[PDB]
Design a protein that fits this description.
- Chains A, B: Keywords: Cell cycle, Cell division, Cytoplasm, Cytoplasmic vesicle, Cytoskeleton, Nucleus, Phosphoprotein.
- The structure is cut from a larger assembly and holds 2 copies of chain A (181 residues).
- Chain A has 181 residues and is mostly helical.
- Chain A is 74% helix and 0% strand.
- At the A-B interface, helix 2 and helix 3 of A face helix 2 of B.
């Protein structure tokens, strides 16, 4: 298969990973001053949704870094496992997590479309329609938490609002039922 | 056969060997400061993959120098063995190592394509499809180690990280199970 198209794809993935990380950092700083505005100005719940979007983004940041490590370590053993024909256990975790998150990351990046195709084009043993679904069970559970879509515990969203109000110097009063939870 | 096309090919091989050696040296210095950055900044494992790529490159550097010696010594006896019709034992090691590494070096250089063709065009005794495969068994095992694709022992990758942290003055703590291994 097109393994150097795959490789330069990965390189662009890494480049855009860095770029998007940086851009989202920038706008996240602006948005944190903005959240200081919303919290300072009335609807802390509006700021609560804003910071929900932000903590979502931060889950994405952490997941981005984890998978950046994964694509880079897979890139290390390009020719080596390319000599092989099945995936090894040393890369089974990375491959499983990547295969699992790839559909979640299909939209975020178009290179990864080809990266996943070439992955599945690379293997059939524990690879394919369901065989790939069988081998993908070794996905990183930590990334899974960093890729879980949920409301954080309102004690923690309150703590994010508290540490924001700390860092950004607004008055925040958590809901004591949740501030105790 | 085209033995002076072969010869100027070899000359370009040597020229680009020097050039690529120099360029990879330059960017390797930049990449070593960069590895000092990654090690200094968080993911030492990211730096670990980076320095895995680098130590791979250094295996390539050493292999490059070895084969540079080989092509130059073969160049010394151009007309002499050209008078002969089979390869001699004095060049059997160099020829075997070159024939063996040439497919690994097919991609790195396009001149060597012709150099290998003209090599096989030079000989049939222990030369050809499998006869060349038979005579290539005298490849340099040291270069073979410098052309082996493997993970170095993690005590040694830790030692490379330790001597980098020494030279580049970052804090590195090897995995004591591997730092003892």
């Amino acid at each position: 298969f097109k393994a150097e198209r795959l490789r330069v794809n990965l390189e662009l993935v890494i480049n855009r990973l860095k770029l998007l990380e940086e851009k989202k950092t920038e706008l996240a700083q602006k948005a944190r001053k903005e959240i200081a505005d919303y919290l300072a100005a009335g609807k802390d719940e509006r700021a609560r949704i804003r910071v929900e979007h932000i903590i979502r983004e931060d889950y994405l940041v952490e997941a981005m870094e984890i998978l950046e490590l994964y694509c880079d370590l897979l890139l290390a053993r390009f020719g080596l496992i390319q000599s092989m024909k099945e995936l090894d256990s040393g890369l089974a975790e990375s491959v499983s997590t990547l295969i699992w998150a790839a559909p979640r990351l299909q939209s975020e990046v178009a290179e990864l479309k080809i990266v996943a195709d070439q992955l599945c084009a690379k293997y059939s043993k524990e690879y394919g329609k369901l065989c790939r679904t069988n081998q993908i069970g070794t996905v990183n559970d930590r990334l899974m938490h960093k890729l879980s879509v949920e409301a954080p515990p309102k004690i923690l969203v309150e703590r994010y609002l508290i540490e924001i109000a700390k860092n950004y110097n607004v008055p925040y009063e958590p809901d004591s039922v949740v501030m105790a939870e």
